[PDB]
Ligand binder design. Structure first.
Ligand code: UZV
Ligand code: ZN
Length: 423
Protein backbone atom coordinates (compact mmCIF):
# COMPACT_ATOMS: atom_id res chain seq x y z
CA UNK A 1 0.00 0.00 0.00
CA UNK A 2 3.07 2.25 -0.35
CA UNK A 3 4.21 3.86 -3.59
CA UNK A 4 7.61 4.96 -2.19
CA UNK A 5 9.03 2.10 -0.17
CA UNK A 6 11.97 4.01 1.36
CA UNK A 7 11.79 7.19 3.41
CA UNK A 8 14.80 8.88 1.84
CA UNK A 9 16.94 11.45 3.63
CA UNK A 10 18.79 13.87 1.39
CA UNK A 11 22.08 13.10 3.14
CA UNK A 12 21.71 9.32 2.78
CA UNK A 13 24.93 7.97 1.20
CA UNK A 14 25.02 7.37 -2.54
CA UNK A 15 24.74 3.73 -3.56
CA UNK A 16 24.75 3.86 -7.35
CA UNK A 17 21.31 2.23 -7.53
CA UNK A 18 18.46 4.34 -6.11
CA UNK A 19 20.59 7.09 -4.49
CA UNK A 20 23.08 8.33 -7.03
CA UNK A 21 24.75 11.20 -8.81
CA UNK A 22 23.31 11.43 -12.32
CA UNK A 23 23.65 13.38 -15.52
CA UNK A 24 20.76 13.97 -17.86
CA UNK A 25 21.67 13.04 -21.44
CA UNK A 26 23.28 15.29 -24.04
CA UNK A 27 22.46 18.51 -22.22
CA UNK A 28 25.50 20.53 -23.21
CA UNK A 29 27.66 19.89 -20.18
CA UNK A 30 26.66 19.68 -16.52
CA UNK A 31 27.96 18.55 -13.15
CA UNK A 32 26.23 15.41 -11.79
CA UNK A 33 23.44 16.02 -9.29
CA UNK A 34 22.27 13.85 -6.41
CA UNK A 35 19.03 12.06 -7.39
CA UNK A 36 16.68 9.59 -5.73
CA UNK A 37 14.75 6.76 -7.39
CA UNK A 38 11.49 6.73 -5.42
CA UNK A 39 9.76 4.09 -7.56
CA UNK A 40 10.49 1.97 -10.60
CA UNK A 41 10.99 4.39 -13.54
CA UNK A 42 10.49 7.56 -11.41
CA UNK A 43 13.33 9.76 -10.04
CA UNK A 44 13.39 12.94 -7.93
CA UNK A 45 16.12 15.59 -8.29
CA UNK A 46 15.85 18.11 -5.39
CA UNK A 47 17.59 20.85 -7.35
CA UNK A 48 16.55 24.00 -9.13
CA UNK A 49 16.29 23.11 -12.82
CA UNK A 50 19.21 24.90 -14.44
CA UNK A 51 19.80 21.97 -16.81
CA UNK A 52 16.89 21.00 -19.08
CA UNK A 53 16.91 24.36 -20.93
CA UNK A 54 20.27 26.01 -21.79
CA UNK A 55 18.35 29.31 -22.05
CA UNK A 56 17.39 28.97 -18.35
CA UNK A 57 20.49 28.75 -16.16
CA UNK A 58 20.21 31.94 -14.11
CA UNK A 59 17.87 31.89 -11.12
CA UNK A 60 17.09 35.62 -10.84
CA UNK A 61 14.62 37.50 -13.09
CA UNK A 62 15.24 38.16 -16.79
CA UNK A 63 15.43 41.73 -18.12
CA UNK A 64 11.64 41.50 -17.63
CA UNK A 65 11.24 40.93 -21.37
CA UNK A 66 8.64 38.21 -20.77
CA UNK A 67 7.71 39.23 -17.22
CA UNK A 68 4.44 37.58 -16.26
CA UNK A 69 2.90 39.45 -13.29
CA UNK A 70 1.93 35.98 -12.04
CA UNK A 71 5.52 35.00 -11.15
CA UNK A 72 7.69 34.62 -8.09
CA UNK A 73 11.49 34.71 -7.84
CA UNK A 74 13.85 33.66 -5.05
CA UNK A 75 17.37 32.71 -6.14
CA UNK A 76 18.09 31.11 -2.76
CA UNK A 77 15.18 28.67 -2.60
CA UNK A 78 16.32 25.03 -2.60
CA UNK A 79 20.01 25.87 -2.24
CA UNK A 80 20.62 24.20 1.15
CA UNK A 81 20.68 20.58 2.30
CA UNK A 82 17.82 21.09 4.77
CA UNK A 83 15.60 22.49 1.99
CA UNK A 84 16.50 19.61 -0.32
CA UNK A 85 15.69 17.13 2.45
CA UNK A 86 12.34 18.82 2.94
CA UNK A 87 11.65 18.97 -0.81
CA UNK A 88 12.30 15.22 -1.08
CA UNK A 89 10.00 14.33 1.83
CA UNK A 90 7.33 16.72 0.52
CA UNK A 91 7.36 15.22 -2.95
CA UNK A 92 7.27 11.64 -1.62
CA UNK A 93 4.36 12.53 0.67
CA UNK A 94 2.36 13.95 -2.27
CA UNK A 95 3.00 10.78 -4.28
CA UNK A 96 1.65 8.75 -1.37
CA UNK A 97 -1.40 11.03 -1.14
CA UNK A 98 -2.08 10.52 -4.85
CA UNK A 99 -1.47 6.76 -4.59
CA UNK A 100 -3.86 6.52 -1.62
CA UNK A 101 -6.82 7.18 -3.97
CA UNK A 102 -8.11 4.70 -6.52
CA UNK A 103 -7.75 7.26 -9.29
CA UNK A 104 -4.16 8.12 -8.40
CA UNK A 105 -3.21 4.45 -8.12
CA UNK A 106 -4.59 4.04 -11.65
CA UNK A 107 -2.79 7.14 -12.96
CA UNK A 108 0.58 6.20 -11.44
CA UNK A 109 0.20 2.67 -12.80
CA UNK A 110 -0.38 4.10 -16.29
CA UNK A 111 2.72 6.24 -15.86
CA UNK A 112 5.01 3.40 -14.80
CA UNK A 113 3.80 1.29 -17.72
CA UNK A 114 4.14 4.26 -20.07
CA UNK A 115 7.68 3.41 -21.15
CA UNK A 116 8.81 5.69 -24.03
CA UNK A 117 8.76 3.75 -27.29
CA UNK A 118 11.93 2.21 -28.78
CA UNK A 119 11.75 4.06 -32.07
CA UNK A 120 15.35 5.18 -32.47
CA UNK A 121 16.37 2.74 -35.21
CA UNK A 122 17.01 3.78 -38.80
CA UNK A 123 16.53 0.18 -40.01
CA UNK A 124 12.90 -0.99 -40.02
CA UNK A 125 13.97 -4.51 -39.03
CA UNK A 126 15.58 -3.46 -35.72
CA UNK A 127 14.17 -2.11 -32.44
CA UNK A 128 16.37 0.44 -30.65
CA UNK A 129 16.03 2.82 -27.67
CA UNK A 130 15.95 6.61 -28.03
CA UNK A 131 18.93 8.11 -26.18
CA UNK A 132 17.14 11.09 -24.64
CA UNK A 133 14.81 8.78 -22.69
CA UNK A 134 17.61 7.74 -20.28
CA UNK A 135 19.82 9.20 -17.58
CA UNK A 136 23.46 8.40 -16.79
CA UNK A 137 23.93 6.95 -13.30
CA UNK A 138 27.36 7.04 -11.64
CA UNK A 139 28.08 3.51 -10.32
CA UNK A 140 29.98 2.64 -7.08
CA UNK A 141 33.11 2.21 -9.19
CA UNK A 142 32.75 5.71 -10.65
CA UNK A 143 31.66 4.75 -14.17
CA UNK A 144 28.43 5.79 -15.88
CA UNK A 145 25.65 3.39 -16.83
CA UNK A 146 22.60 4.41 -18.82
CA UNK A 147 19.16 3.78 -17.33
CA UNK A 148 15.79 4.22 -19.05
CA UNK A 149 13.23 6.12 -17.03
CA UNK A 150 9.80 7.66 -17.47
CA UNK A 151 9.56 10.62 -15.09
CA UNK A 152 11.75 13.04 -13.15
CA UNK A 153 10.43 15.50 -10.58
CA UNK A 154 12.81 18.49 -10.45
CA UNK A 155 12.71 21.84 -8.69
CA UNK A 156 11.61 24.94 -10.59
CA UNK A 157 13.87 27.17 -12.64
CA UNK A 158 14.09 30.98 -12.12
CA UNK A 159 10.32 31.42 -11.84
CA UNK A 160 9.43 29.36 -8.79
CA UNK A 161 5.74 29.04 -9.65
CA UNK A 162 6.09 28.17 -13.33
CA UNK A 163 5.69 24.43 -13.06
CA UNK A 164 6.50 23.22 -16.57
CA UNK A 165 6.78 19.85 -18.30
CA UNK A 166 10.12 19.44 -20.07
CA UNK A 167 11.15 16.63 -22.36
CA UNK A 168 13.96 16.30 -24.84
CA UNK A 169 12.89 16.47 -28.45
CA UNK A 170 13.91 14.57 -31.52
CA UNK A 171 15.36 15.83 -34.79
CA UNK A 172 12.33 14.58 -36.76
CA UNK A 173 9.93 12.81 -34.37
CA UNK A 174 7.45 14.66 -32.16
CA UNK A 175 7.62 12.17 -29.33
CA UNK A 176 4.87 13.64 -27.14
CA UNK A 177 2.41 13.71 -30.07
CA UNK A 178 3.23 10.65 -32.22
CA UNK A 179 2.27 7.90 -29.78
CA UNK A 180 5.92 7.18 -28.83
CA UNK A 181 6.28 9.07 -25.55
CA UNK A 182 9.39 10.51 -23.95
CA UNK A 183 10.88 10.90 -20.50
CA UNK A 184 9.11 13.76 -18.71
CA UNK A 185 10.80 16.32 -16.44
CA UNK A 186 8.22 18.11 -14.26
CA UNK A 187 9.34 21.33 -12.59
CA UNK A 188 7.44 21.32 -9.32
CA UNK A 189 7.69 22.40 -5.73
CA UNK A 190 5.78 21.15 -2.66
CA UNK A 191 6.93 24.22 -0.70
CA UNK A 192 4.52 26.77 -2.24
CA UNK A 193 0.86 26.77 -3.23
CA UNK A 194 -1.71 29.09 -4.76
CA UNK A 195 -4.73 30.90 -3.39
CA UNK A 196 -8.11 30.80 -5.08
CA UNK A 197 -11.55 32.25 -4.38
CA UNK A 198 -14.46 30.08 -3.25
CA UNK A 199 -17.04 32.03 -5.31
CA UNK A 200 -16.86 31.47 -9.08
CA UNK A 201 -17.79 35.09 -9.79
CA UNK A 202 -14.86 36.31 -7.68
CA UNK A 203 -12.37 33.62 -8.78
CA UNK A 204 -12.91 34.36 -12.49
CA UNK A 205 -12.72 38.12 -12.00
CA UNK A 206 -9.17 39.58 -12.20
CA UNK A 207 -9.88 42.54 -9.86
CA UNK A 208 -11.40 40.72 -6.86
CA UNK A 209 -10.31 38.51 -3.99
CA UNK A 210 -7.05 37.97 -2.08
CA UNK A 211 -6.87 34.17 -2.35
CA UNK A 212 -8.72 33.02 0.77
CA UNK A 213 -8.40 29.26 0.08
CA UNK A 214 -5.18 27.37 -0.64
CA UNK A 215 -4.94 24.84 -3.46
CA UNK A 216 -3.93 21.37 -2.15
CA UNK A 217 -0.50 20.74 -3.75
CA UNK A 218 -1.46 17.08 -4.24
CA UNK A 219 -3.98 18.37 -6.80
CA UNK A 220 -1.30 20.49 -8.47
CA UNK A 221 1.08 17.54 -8.74
CA UNK A 222 -1.68 15.23 -10.01
CA UNK A 223 -2.43 17.87 -12.65
CA UNK A 224 1.19 17.84 -13.83
CA UNK A 225 1.24 14.04 -13.79
CA UNK A 226 -1.87 14.01 -16.02
CA UNK A 227 0.08 15.97 -18.65
CA UNK A 228 3.00 13.57 -18.11
CA UNK A 229 0.62 10.70 -18.82
CA UNK A 230 -0.50 12.27 -22.10
CA UNK A 231 3.08 12.93 -23.10
CA UNK A 232 4.36 9.48 -22.12
CA UNK A 233 1.69 7.92 -24.33
CA UNK A 234 2.43 10.38 -27.12
CA UNK A 235 -1.10 11.78 -27.15
CA UNK A 236 -0.59 15.37 -25.96
CA UNK A 237 -2.52 17.96 -27.97
CA UNK A 238 -0.36 20.45 -29.93
CA UNK A 239 -0.17 23.62 -27.77
CA UNK A 240 -1.26 25.85 -30.67
CA UNK A 241 -4.62 24.10 -30.71
CA UNK A 242 -6.26 26.66 -28.42
CA UNK A 243 -9.65 27.84 -27.24
CA UNK A 244 -10.29 31.52 -28.02
CA UNK A 245 -11.88 32.12 -24.63
CA UNK A 246 -15.28 33.59 -25.51
CA UNK A 247 -16.90 32.85 -22.12
CA UNK A 248 -15.00 35.39 -19.98
CA UNK A 249 -15.19 39.11 -20.78
CA UNK A 250 -11.82 39.73 -19.12
CA UNK A 251 -10.12 36.83 -20.92
CA UNK A 252 -11.25 38.10 -24.34
CA UNK A 253 -10.66 41.81 -23.71
CA UNK A 254 -7.06 40.68 -23.54
CA UNK A 255 -6.05 38.21 -26.21
CA UNK A 256 -6.20 35.22 -23.90
CA UNK A 257 -6.33 31.77 -25.48
CA UNK A 258 -6.06 28.52 -23.50
CA UNK A 259 -4.69 25.29 -24.95
CA UNK A 260 -6.97 22.32 -25.54
CA UNK A 261 -4.36 20.28 -23.68
CA UNK A 262 -5.04 22.35 -20.54
CA UNK A 263 -8.84 22.20 -20.89
CA UNK A 264 -8.55 18.42 -21.32
CA UNK A 265 -6.34 18.06 -18.26
CA UNK A 266 -8.66 20.06 -16.00
CA UNK A 267 -11.68 18.11 -17.23
CA UNK A 268 -15.22 18.72 -15.99
CA UNK A 269 -16.96 21.52 -17.86
CA UNK A 270 -13.72 22.94 -19.29
CA UNK A 271 -13.23 19.94 -21.55
CA UNK A 272 -16.56 20.68 -23.25
CA UNK A 273 -14.94 23.72 -24.93
CA UNK A 274 -13.18 21.17 -27.17
CA UNK A 275 -15.80 20.57 -29.87
CA UNK A 276 -16.92 17.11 -30.94
CA UNK A 277 -15.52 17.31 -34.47
CA UNK A 278 -11.97 18.25 -33.46
CA UNK A 279 -11.97 15.86 -30.48
CA UNK A 280 -12.76 13.07 -32.96
CA UNK A 281 -10.07 14.39 -35.29
CA UNK A 282 -7.57 13.97 -32.44
CA UNK A 283 -8.68 10.45 -31.51
CA UNK A 284 -8.40 9.32 -35.13
CA UNK A 285 -4.95 10.93 -35.42
CA UNK A 286 -3.68 9.14 -32.31
CA UNK A 287 -5.43 5.93 -33.34
CA UNK A 288 -3.39 6.01 -36.55
CA UNK A 289 -0.19 6.72 -34.61
CA UNK A 290 -0.74 3.59 -32.51
CA UNK A 291 -1.19 1.61 -35.73
CA UNK A 292 2.16 2.93 -37.00
CA UNK A 293 3.69 1.68 -33.74
CA UNK A 294 2.04 -1.71 -34.33
CA UNK A 295 3.45 -1.69 -37.86
CA UNK A 296 6.94 -0.84 -36.57
CA UNK A 297 6.86 -3.66 -34.00
CA UNK A 298 5.68 -6.16 -36.61
CA UNK A 299 8.53 -5.12 -38.94
CA UNK A 300 11.08 -5.50 -36.13
CA UNK A 301 13.19 -8.65 -36.40
CA UNK A 302 16.23 -7.71 -34.28
CA UNK A 303 17.02 -6.20 -30.87
CA UNK A 304 19.70 -3.69 -29.87
CA UNK A 305 21.36 -3.94 -26.47
CA UNK A 306 21.67 -6.77 -23.95
CA UNK A 307 19.03 -5.33 -21.61
CA UNK A 308 16.13 -7.48 -22.90
CA UNK A 309 15.08 -9.91 -25.61
CA UNK A 310 13.33 -8.71 -28.76
CA UNK A 311 9.91 -10.09 -27.94
CA UNK A 312 10.37 -9.09 -24.33
CA UNK A 313 10.39 -5.47 -25.54
CA UNK A 314 7.62 -6.39 -27.99
CA UNK A 315 5.52 -7.55 -25.05
CA UNK A 316 6.40 -4.38 -23.12
CA UNK A 317 4.89 -2.26 -25.87
CA UNK A 318 2.03 -4.70 -26.43
CA UNK A 319 1.05 -4.05 -22.81
CA UNK A 320 1.63 -0.28 -22.85
CA UNK A 321 -0.52 0.31 -25.93
CA UNK A 322 -2.97 -2.56 -25.22
CA UNK A 323 -2.34 -4.10 -28.63
CA UNK A 324 -4.02 -7.25 -29.87
CA UNK A 325 -1.90 -10.23 -30.93
CA UNK A 326 -3.07 -12.66 -33.60
CA UNK A 327 -2.20 -16.34 -34.01
CA UNK A 328 0.82 -15.26 -36.11
CA UNK A 329 2.30 -12.86 -33.54
CA UNK A 330 1.33 -9.83 -35.66
CA UNK A 331 0.26 -6.83 -33.58
CA UNK A 332 -2.86 -4.84 -34.36
CA UNK A 333 -4.81 -2.07 -32.64
CA UNK A 334 -8.39 -2.87 -31.60
CA UNK A 335 -10.63 0.20 -31.68
CA UNK A 336 -12.51 -0.73 -28.50
CA UNK A 337 -9.25 -1.17 -26.56
CA UNK A 338 -7.72 1.98 -28.06
CA UNK A 339 -10.78 4.13 -27.32
CA UNK A 340 -10.68 2.77 -23.75
CA UNK A 341 -7.02 3.53 -23.14
CA UNK A 342 -7.28 6.95 -24.78
CA UNK A 343 -10.33 7.78 -22.65
CA UNK A 344 -8.68 6.61 -19.44
CA UNK A 345 -5.70 8.94 -20.04
CA UNK A 346 -7.74 11.94 -21.26
CA UNK A 347 -11.17 11.79 -19.55
CA UNK A 348 -10.76 9.67 -16.42
CA UNK A 349 -7.42 11.24 -15.33
CA UNK A 350 -8.47 14.87 -14.82
CA UNK A 351 -7.91 17.54 -12.18
CA UNK A 352 -11.65 17.73 -11.58
CA UNK A 353 -11.83 14.00 -10.88
CA UNK A 354 -8.89 14.18 -8.48
CA UNK A 355 -10.73 16.92 -6.58
CA UNK A 356 -13.60 14.48 -6.06
CA UNK A 357 -11.24 11.80 -4.73
CA UNK A 358 -9.31 14.11 -2.38
CA UNK A 359 -12.51 15.85 -1.15
CA UNK A 360 -10.78 19.24 -1.27
CA UNK A 361 -11.89 22.68 -2.29
CA UNK A 362 -10.40 23.70 -5.63
CA UNK A 363 -10.81 26.15 -8.49
CA UNK A 364 -13.94 25.23 -10.47
CA UNK A 365 -12.34 25.99 -13.85
CA UNK A 366 -8.96 26.54 -15.46
CA UNK A 367 -10.41 29.79 -16.85
CA UNK A 368 -9.87 31.83 -13.72
CA UNK A 369 -7.31 34.34 -12.39
CA UNK A 370 -4.47 33.66 -9.96
CA UNK A 371 -4.87 35.39 -6.59
CA UNK A 372 -1.78 34.77 -4.46
CA UNK A 373 1.16 32.49 -3.76
CA UNK A 374 1.78 31.06 -0.27
CA UNK A 375 4.78 29.48 1.41
CA UNK A 376 3.82 26.20 3.08
CA UNK A 377 5.37 23.21 4.85
CA UNK A 378 3.50 19.92 4.34
CA UNK A 379 6.24 17.66 5.73
CA UNK A 380 5.09 17.74 9.41
CA UNK A 381 2.06 15.56 10.03
CA UNK A 382 0.59 18.22 12.33
CA UNK A 383 0.37 20.36 9.17
CA UNK A 384 -0.66 17.97 6.40
CA UNK A 385 -1.25 14.23 5.98
CA UNK A 386 -1.44 11.66 3.22
CA UNK A 387 -5.09 10.97 4.00
CA UNK A 388 -6.45 14.45 4.74
CA UNK A 389 -4.11 17.03 3.22
CA UNK A 390 -4.61 20.19 5.29
CA UNK A 391 -8.14 19.24 6.49
CA UNK A 392 -6.94 17.08 9.37
CA UNK A 393 -9.52 14.68 10.80
CA UNK A 394 -10.65 15.15 14.42
CA UNK A 395 -9.61 18.81 14.58
CA UNK A 396 -11.28 22.14 13.87
CA UNK A 397 -9.73 21.80 10.40
CA UNK A 398 -11.66 18.66 9.37
CA UNK A 399 -14.95 20.30 8.36
CA UNK A 400 -15.83 22.87 5.70
CA UNK A 401 -12.30 22.66 4.20
CA UNK A 402 -11.16 24.73 7.18
CA UNK A 403 -7.63 23.40 6.74
CA UNK A 404 -7.43 25.07 3.31
CA UNK A 405 -8.99 28.26 4.71
CA UNK A 406 -5.87 30.42 5.03
CA UNK A 407 -7.68 32.75 7.42
CA UNK A 408 -8.67 29.94 9.79
CA UNK A 409 -5.51 27.82 9.30
CA UNK A 410 -3.27 30.88 9.08
CA UNK A 411 -0.17 29.40 10.69
CA UNK A 412 0.12 26.97 7.77
CA UNK A 413 0.36 29.67 5.07
CA UNK A 414 2.60 32.71 4.54
CA UNK A 415 1.41 34.99 1.76
CA UNK A 416 4.39 36.00 -0.35
CA UNK A 417 2.81 37.86 -3.26
CA UNK A 418 -0.66 39.01 -4.33
CA UNK A 419 -1.63 38.82 -8.00
CA UNK A 420 -5.07 40.46 -7.99
CA UNK A 421 -5.03 43.83 -9.73
CA UNK A 422 -1.74 43.13 -11.53
CA UNK A 423 -3.63 42.00 -14.66
S1 UZV B 1 2.78 20.01 -17.95
C1 UZV B 1 3.22 21.73 -17.63
C2 UZV B 1 2.64 22.66 -18.70
C3 UZV B 1 2.44 24.05 -18.10
C4 UZV B 1 2.09 23.95 -16.62
C5 UZV B 1 0.63 23.60 -16.36
O1 UZV B 1 0.24 22.47 -16.39
N1 UZV B 1 -0.30 24.65 -16.09
O2 UZV B 1 -1.63 24.31 -15.89
ZN1 ZN C 1 -1.62 22.25 -17.02
Amino acid sequence: MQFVNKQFNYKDPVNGVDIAYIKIPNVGQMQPVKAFKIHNKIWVIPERDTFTNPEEGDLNPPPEAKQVPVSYYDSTYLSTDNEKDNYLKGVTKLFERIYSTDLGRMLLTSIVRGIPFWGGSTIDTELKVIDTNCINVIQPDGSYRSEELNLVIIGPSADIIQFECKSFGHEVLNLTRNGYGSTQYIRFSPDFTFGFEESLEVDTNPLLGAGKFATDPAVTLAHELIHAGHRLYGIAINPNRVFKVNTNAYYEMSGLEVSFEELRTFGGHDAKFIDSLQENEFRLYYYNKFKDIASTLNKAKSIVGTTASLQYMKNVFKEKYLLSEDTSGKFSVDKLKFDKLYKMLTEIYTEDNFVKFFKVLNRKTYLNFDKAVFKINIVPKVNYTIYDGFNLRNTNLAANFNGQNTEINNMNFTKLKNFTGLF
